[PDB]
Design a protein around this motif. Structure first.
Motif, short mmCIF file in Angstrom:
data_model
loop_
_atom_site.label_atom_id
_atom_site.label_comp_id
_atom_site.label_asym_id
_atom_site.label_seq_id
_atom_site.Cartn_x
_atom_site.Cartn_y
_atom_site.Cartn_z
N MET A 161 49.31 -127.79 -4.56
CA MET A 161 48.70 -127.89 -5.94
C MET A 161 48.88 -126.46 -6.67
O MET A 161 48.56 -125.53 -6.38
CB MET A 161 47.40 -128.69 -6.13
CG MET A 161 46.26 -128.03 -5.18
SD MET A 161 44.97 -129.02 -4.90
CE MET A 161 44.59 -129.70 -6.62
N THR A 162 49.01 -126.79 -8.23
CA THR A 162 49.15 -125.91 -8.83
C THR A 162 48.38 -126.00 -10.18
O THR A 162 48.22 -126.98 -10.72
CB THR A 162 50.59 -124.99 -9.16
OG1 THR A 162 51.07 -126.28 -9.79
CG2 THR A 162 51.37 -124.71 -8.00
N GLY A 163 48.02 -124.80 -11.08
CA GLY A 163 47.47 -124.98 -12.03
C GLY A 163 47.10 -123.75 -12.90
O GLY A 163 47.49 -122.68 -12.65
N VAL A 164 46.17 -123.90 -13.73
CA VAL A 164 45.72 -122.97 -14.40
C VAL A 164 44.73 -121.93 -13.47
O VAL A 164 43.35 -122.56 -13.15
CB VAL A 164 44.91 -123.16 -16.02
CG1 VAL A 164 44.33 -121.83 -16.42
CG2 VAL A 164 45.73 -123.80 -16.66
N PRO A 165 44.87 -120.65 -13.45
CA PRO A 165 44.07 -119.88 -12.55
C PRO A 165 42.55 -119.84 -12.96
O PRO A 165 42.26 -119.78 -14.32
CB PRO A 165 44.41 -118.45 -12.42
CG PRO A 165 46.17 -118.61 -12.56
CD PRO A 165 45.86 -119.68 -13.62
N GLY A 166 41.59 -119.95 -11.85
CA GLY A 166 40.26 -119.94 -12.38
C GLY A 166 39.52 -121.22 -12.70
O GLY A 166 38.26 -121.12 -12.83
N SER A 167 40.27 -122.31 -12.53
CA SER A 167 39.52 -123.77 -12.81
C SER A 167 38.62 -123.93 -11.62
O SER A 167 39.06 -123.58 -10.38
CB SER A 167 40.78 -124.65 -13.19
OG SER A 167 41.50 -124.81 -11.90
N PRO A 211 43.19 -120.00 -6.69
CA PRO A 211 43.44 -118.64 -6.77
C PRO A 211 43.83 -117.89 -7.67
O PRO A 211 44.74 -118.81 -8.75
CB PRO A 211 44.57 -118.57 -5.30
CG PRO A 211 44.07 -119.80 -4.61
CD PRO A 211 43.70 -120.90 -5.47
N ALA A 212 44.29 -116.51 -7.79
CA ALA A 212 44.87 -116.03 -8.72
C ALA A 212 46.34 -116.41 -9.11
O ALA A 212 46.84 -116.46 -10.29
CB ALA A 212 44.77 -114.56 -8.77
N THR A 213 47.04 -116.47 -8.02
CA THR A 213 48.31 -116.74 -7.95
C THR A 213 48.59 -118.01 -8.55
O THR A 213 49.99 -118.42 -9.00
CB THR A 213 49.00 -116.47 -6.64
OG1 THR A 213 50.44 -116.74 -6.77
CG2 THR A 213 48.33 -117.36 -5.56
N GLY A 214 47.39 -118.86 -8.64
CA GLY A 214 47.91 -120.39 -9.03
C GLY A 214 48.51 -121.50 -8.24
O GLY A 214 49.05 -122.24 -8.46
N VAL A 215 48.47 -120.96 -6.80
CA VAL A 215 49.09 -122.05 -5.83
C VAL A 215 47.92 -121.99 -4.81
O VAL A 215 47.18 -121.19 -4.41
CB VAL A 215 50.31 -121.34 -5.21
CG1 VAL A 215 49.97 -120.13 -4.17
CG2 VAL A 215 51.10 -122.49 -4.63
N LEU A 216 47.90 -123.25 -4.06
CA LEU A 216 47.01 -123.66 -3.32
C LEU A 216 47.52 -124.89 -2.28
O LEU A 216 48.28 -125.50 -2.58
CB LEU A 216 45.40 -124.09 -3.96
CG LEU A 216 44.50 -124.56 -3.03
CD1 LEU A 216 44.22 -123.55 -1.89
CD2 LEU A 216 43.29 -125.15 -3.51
#
Lengths: 390, 265, 286, 391, 95, 133, 50
Positions: free
Chosen positions: A93-99, A125-130
């Protein structure tokens, strides 16, 4: 020596003679008299004793005990049936970092709902990938579908509603056991004894979802076995592969960390996991090293033979253990086995773009040397021709 | 020329299995970096039969047992015996022949079931190497199933329900093997052979369950002792021994429904 | 996901089947009333037996032992003998066959607990004057003397000895199957003794100079033994009071035989580890 | 020793008498001499047999009392089976003119023992004219173990030399079947509770190595104590092995035992590459021989049969003695005194060849032959001195 | 000396056998150490570290009793050897 | 299929006795200061059978009587014969077989009654040594 | 070392004697053995001085 259950006729005569000799002083037993009924009733009480005894001593034998008696005297010794299992897999999953994230994430791929199985980080995470690990909500074989696209069940601010599963792989589903299959594997377990042999530990790791191969540290790794002031070896480490799920079969560190904790426990060295008390270990991944192979002269062979050589070479490199040299001689042998010893074959290994890659070095003989934590990954195979014949 | 309905025909299936196994198992042609694994699997397969035989003949002390044990050890120690498909098949077929004749009756149930369990795996190699390894598994399971059926024919069916339950255990295994052989026309001839053998097994197993002692359910007016029940139904109280195995309940409370044979005066 | 449960092979997932109903009656179902009147049906039929067989009655005296009731108009007949035979088999089966089956399994033995231990060749390490020096400076049942430590042989009461021996047999039977020596499996093996191992270190460890474990009680009661085929066992206290038994004051206030046996078993299992230490802590009843 | 508690006979006989009166006779007791008295006594007798039947049928299920047949049936359930007989084995060298065809029914002979090829013989002799075969004794049993190096072909074939020689070693490994009692003790040992089974597992495993005969644990003299006066318990695993049927006195050279250690523990040791589990490290030892002469005195008065057996028993006792263990005059005297009789005048003495000193040998005051670590008492000669008595 | 390191079952057997032997000893006969030692070896095994010794109660003097150089007990006429107490001691290290 | 009611079955009891005798009689394991007494008792038991046989066949002059008499003398003279439970049982069983066939009928009443009289004693040793006697 | 037999018999001036005791399995180490022999046939003719 053996004494067994007497037969009917041989049993009644024993009672009749004993009764006659001691009570009636040798007198014959006239049928239909009172003594006749006394004798036969005495025999009946005699036979019912043995019949019940033989019937009951069967129950303690596991090979014949009824189902409800097999579950007991099996849970006593620490063996239980197996219920329906759950399928598992990996997602991204990806999105805006810090959410801000939540521990109640749910995914709906195709008519199937999957729930997060690992601990989700508090923030993206900072890179926006989890990457997570998910398991189906309904146990059974039906959770082994193969789909690649899914959507988050409930929207979350700052995170996209589209997610993907690595390779669309979902494995682990199974049904519950039956009575007969359970009877086996129990009286079969009675003839077994685990011993912690390195093969046993190696086989244990393969029970993790989506794991294909497992190897010890390659020749180019200098291991450490002490980890303390101990007299002789105390530590063990080994690699893993995910050939059917991740590109090149290599997984990110986020996953192998979970395996290490489960297998060796946390904290380590106290036998909290599946490993022996006082034994520490670690499971590690590797980083890909791309290569290109230029086969020379294949173009002058029949098309059928050409494909076979290409397919075999690709398969061999895919299965290559991490941190091990990929010598030219190995590739050449594959060609000779199919094309014949008289063919004018030749192979060479070069890096993509003839650039420099960390952990890669070529020796004089032309082989490829790979350092620790690195694997040979095939990038492209091409056929060239610079000679004449026919 | 009346037909026979008291024994199975194992020669057809065994020969059919031989052809299928020889068709694909060939360690000398598979890609060289997989020959070692394929051969190692075969050595394990024979070892399974060795363990089975040694368990059945534990209390035997004849002069033949020593010879058979020596033969098993010699073949396994030698490393070149399994490079020839002809040698590989002969050891496999003969090994079961000694296993089957070691004991008669229920003694073989557990031993054969274990072998079937071990032969339910599937190879994880690719292309030809997969076929060379699946052949060992598929061939072993079919042989074990065939010999397991022969074992069931040497024991009396305790009950119709139990006798048919045993049959279903065999049909499922044979059906699975048929699907594998017909998955992608992997072996068409083998698929036909398995299908014909399964119906032959059904013709005998069903007959055994329903007609071996020809059991029937009686309806008594109340629980009564085993001795009395035997005398009433037949006329000889000495026959009560039979009722022990087919009816639950204590010997003094058999009923009110009894299972016994058919009186054929 | 599933909830794992302790098992001989570690943590596994358990389940249940569905009731079948094909279990032969056990010793429990048998009763004197059950079959005392039953044999009245083994006699013949006719005008000489119809009335007698119809008027058959049975009542239980003080201590069970069904006995026919003779009314004021009782007509003696062989039917009375048949009832007497019925009472005999119910009694003989209980006194003869029931004990034989009961003592055959380590998980149900009652009277032959001591004999079973001799079958396992069990020897306690706290009763030999030449004990291993690694077993601590002073064991719980040793009081200091000028010429070195000296131990005292306790004579436990009957009930605790029967319960303690029964619990030890169960654990020994479980261990004979072979286990992988990890903490989860070990706790299950000695679980019947009502003792649990727990390491002291909570950090990563694996580098420190010593590994220390301690034993914590899980309950203050053994699981007793039950003679009857039915009912439930009666729990008994797992501890012993020093003063009550009139023992030397140097001994600890409370003595737990269960903890001692568990400590010996674990030490033998993990002997090959070169940095295994035990720190026993005094424990008292709740 | 009964497992089924049996109340006192008086208690039982009252119970039967009470029950009979209550049910049949309506509360009255029995007349001393009447049918009721005799049926009651008979009822008691049958009760005794019922107790015995339960006692026996329980006894016939315990491993240490079961019959010789039910024992093997029980052992099958736990994966323990009796050991079958074994055949000797070894290698044989063959020399002949190249190209001559060979045969599969070939057989040899070494000191009256006939051996047959145990492997598929090749079609014909190779170019070099030298062939190596695997052979197994035609008949099983320990009689196949022999220490020889030259033999002769039994079935002549043209082009093959009539003389055949074995390898530097010799044929061995044959053994007889396993009886019932030795099986029972082995089975019980597995079921019993034994500490440090890892040491026991390795000790049993070593016996599967070819030519191995006995496995001995470290002797009492091998114990050591540090400067603090505290006995030291090592964390390694070690023991001895003997080859009584292959080497003089059964002591093998260092090179032979080195190979065993690598296979058992791996190379490098401890990494689970051998038969041992992971994190197991040890070493297999050998021993050095110290000669001894034993003199028997006062045996002239005994009959010749007694003299022969007494000499034989002592010879066997010394041969099987473990390494690093003392040899005391008491043991030898006891063995002989057990046969002659406790009142006989029997005495023995121990001395070295030529009364010369040796390494690892020390005589204490009492006359014992103390032996150091890694040393075994090897018999040199048994001599019975001669006197004159009974004339 | 040393029995404490043997199994409890073996320890009792040695004690019982020794007591019985002395009880049956004929009057006015020496009670040598070797006889006691042999009883131990028959059951404990020839490789065990065994040792026995005979001492008078309280190390006192009793009429008609003497100890020879070898350590045995010499008994004069009209006197018999009677067991008073058998005790186990340990003064070595092993295991 | 009919039953026989004109003769006894001695094979079962004799085999049953063999197992019991072999189970306990073991002179090589009894405590060493009782082996001599146990063996001496066995020699006496055989001597009783020898005396019985010589009385029954007094007037016989066949060629087998000399052989049997020699066999009895040889066994007793030899000392180690009774150290083996197998040897001891075989001599006892075979010795009775010759005694039974020596004469038929009333001639054996007195001889067997005397032997039963001699075998009514009980051992006065202790522990396992008593069982061996 | 040479194995022995149970049926061997000797002869001394036309009189044949047979072993009267259990012969051992094989010759002892010293190579000398002593046996007990009895005449095959009874009678005074078995007495001789040789």
């Amino acid at each position: 020596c053996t004494i067994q259950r007497p037969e009917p006729q041989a049993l009644r005569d024993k009672i009749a003679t004993r009764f006659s000799t001691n009570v009636l002083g040798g007198a014959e037993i006239i049928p239909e008299s009172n003594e006749f009924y006394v004798v036969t009733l005495e025999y009946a009480m005699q036979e019912e004793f043995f019949a019940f005894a033989e019937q009951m001593w069967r129950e303690q034998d596991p090979r014949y005990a009824c189902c409800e008696n097999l579950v007991k005297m099996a849970a006593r010794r620490g063996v239980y049936p197996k219920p329906a299992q759950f399928a598992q897999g990996y997602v991204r999953m990806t999105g805006v970092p810090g959410s801000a994230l939540n521990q109640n994430l749910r995914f709906q791929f195709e008519n199937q709902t999957y729930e997060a199985a690992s601990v989700v980080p508090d923030q993206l995470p900072a890179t926006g990938v989890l990457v997570l690990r998910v398991s189906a909500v309904t146990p059974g074989p039906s959770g082994n579908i193969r789909v690649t696209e899914g959507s988050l069940v409930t929207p979350v601010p700052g995170i996209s509603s589209a997610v993907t599963a690595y390779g669309g792989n979902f494995c682990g589903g199974d049904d519950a056991e039956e009575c007969e299959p359970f009877r086996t594997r129990y009286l079969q377990r009675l003839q077994y004894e685990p011993r912690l042999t390195v093969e046993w530990l190696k086989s244990k790791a393969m029970e993790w979802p989506c794991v294909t191969d497992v190897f010890d540290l390659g020749p180019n790794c200098c291991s450490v076995n002490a980890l303390g002031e101990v007299e002789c070896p105390n530590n063990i480490e080994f690699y893993v592969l995910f050939r059917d799920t991740f590109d090149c079969g290599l997984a990110p560190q986020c996953v192998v960390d979970e395996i290490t904790d489960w297998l060796f426990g946390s904290p380590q060295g106290l036998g909290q996991g599946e490993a022996e008390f006082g034994i520490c270990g670690k499971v590690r991944t590797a980083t890909a090293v791309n290569l290109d192979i230029y086969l020379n002269g294949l173009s002058c062979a029949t098309p059928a033979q050409a494909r076979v050589v290409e397919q075999r070479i690709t398969d061999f490199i895919n299965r290559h253990p991490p941190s091990t040299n990929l010598t030219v001689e190995q590739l050449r042998f594959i060609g000779l086995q199919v094309l014949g010893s008289s063919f004018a074959f030749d192979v060479a290994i070069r890096s993509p773009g003839d650039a420099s890659q960390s952990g890669l070095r070529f020796n004089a003989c032309g082989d490829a040397e790979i350092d620790c934590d690195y694997k040979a990954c095939l990038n492209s195979v091409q056929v060239i021709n610079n000679n004449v014949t026919t | 020329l009346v037909g026979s309905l008291i024994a199975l025909a194992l020669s057809p299936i065994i020969t059919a299995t031989e052809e299928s196994f020889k068709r694909y198992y060939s360690p000398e042609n598979v890609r060289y970096y997989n020959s070692e694994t394929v051969i190692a699997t075969m050595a394990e397969a024979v070892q399974q039969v060795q363990t089975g035989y040694l368990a059945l003949s534990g209390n035997d002390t004849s002069q033949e047992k020593w010879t058979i044990v020596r033969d098993f050890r010699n073949v396994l120690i030698d490393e070149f015996t399994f490079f020839d498909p002809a040698n590989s098949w002969n050891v496999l077929r003969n090994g079961f022949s000694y296993l089957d004749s070691a004991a008669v009756g229920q003694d073989k149930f557990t031993i054969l079931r274990n072998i079937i369990n071990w032969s339910s795996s599937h190879s994880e190699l690719d292309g030809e190497s997969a076929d060379a390894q699946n052949a060992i598994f598929s061939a072993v399971r079919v042989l074990a199933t065939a010999y397991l059926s022969k074992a069931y024919m040497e024991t009396v069916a305790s009950t119709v329900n139990e006798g048919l339950a045993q049959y279903d255990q065999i049909a499922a295994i044979l059906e699975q093997e048929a699907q594998i052989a017909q998955e992608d026309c992997h072996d068409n001839e083998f698929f036909l052979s398995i299908r014909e053998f399964s119906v032959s097994v059904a013709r005998v197993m069903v007959n055994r369950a329903y007609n071996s002692p020809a059991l029937i359910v009686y309806s008594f007016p109340g629980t009564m002792h085993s001795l009395v029940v035997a005398w009433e139904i037949f006329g000889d109280a000495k026959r009560s021994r039979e009722l022990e195995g087919r009816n639950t309940g204590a010997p003094w409370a058999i009923g009110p429904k009894v299972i016994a044979e058919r009186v054929r005066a | 996901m599933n909830v794992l449960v302790p098992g001989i092979d570690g943590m596994v997932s358990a389940g249940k089947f569905e009731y079948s109903g094909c279990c032969p009656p056990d010793f429990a179902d048998m009763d004197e009333c059950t079959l005392a009147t039953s044999y009245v049906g083994l006699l013949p039929s006719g005008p000489l037996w119809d009335r007698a067989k119809y008027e058959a009655i049975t009542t239980i005296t003080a201590t069970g032992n069904c006995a026919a009731c003779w009314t004021e108009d009782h007509c003696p007949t062989l039917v009375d003998y048949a009832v007497n035979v019925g009472a005999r088999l119910a009694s003989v089966i209980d006194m003869t066959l029931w004990p034989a089956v009961r003592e055959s399994d380590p998980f149900t033995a009652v009277t032959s607990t001591a004999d079973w231990l001799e079958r396992f060749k069990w020897v306690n390490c706290f009763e030999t004057s030449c004990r291993s020096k690694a077993l601590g400076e002073i064991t719980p049942i040793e009081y200091m003397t000028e010429c070195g430590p000296v131990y005292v042989a306790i004579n436990y009461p009957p009930s605790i000895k029967q319960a303690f021996e029964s619990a030890l047999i169960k654990s020994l039977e479980r261990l004979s199957m072979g286990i992988i020596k990890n903490l989860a499996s070990i706790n299950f093996v000695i679980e019947p003794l009502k003792v649990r191992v727990v390491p002291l270190d909570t950090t990563n460890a694996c580098e420190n100079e010593t590994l220390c474990v301690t034993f914590e009680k899980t309950s203050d009661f053994f699981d007793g033994v039950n003679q009857n085929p039915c009912g439930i066992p009666s729990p008994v206290a797992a501890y012993i009071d020093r003063d009550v038994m009139q023992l030397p004051s140097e001994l600890p206030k409370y003595i737990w035989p269960g903890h001692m046996a568990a400590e010996c078993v674990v030490r033998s299992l993990l002997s090959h580890v070169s940095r295994f230490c035990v720190v026993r802590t005094d424990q008292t009843p709740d």
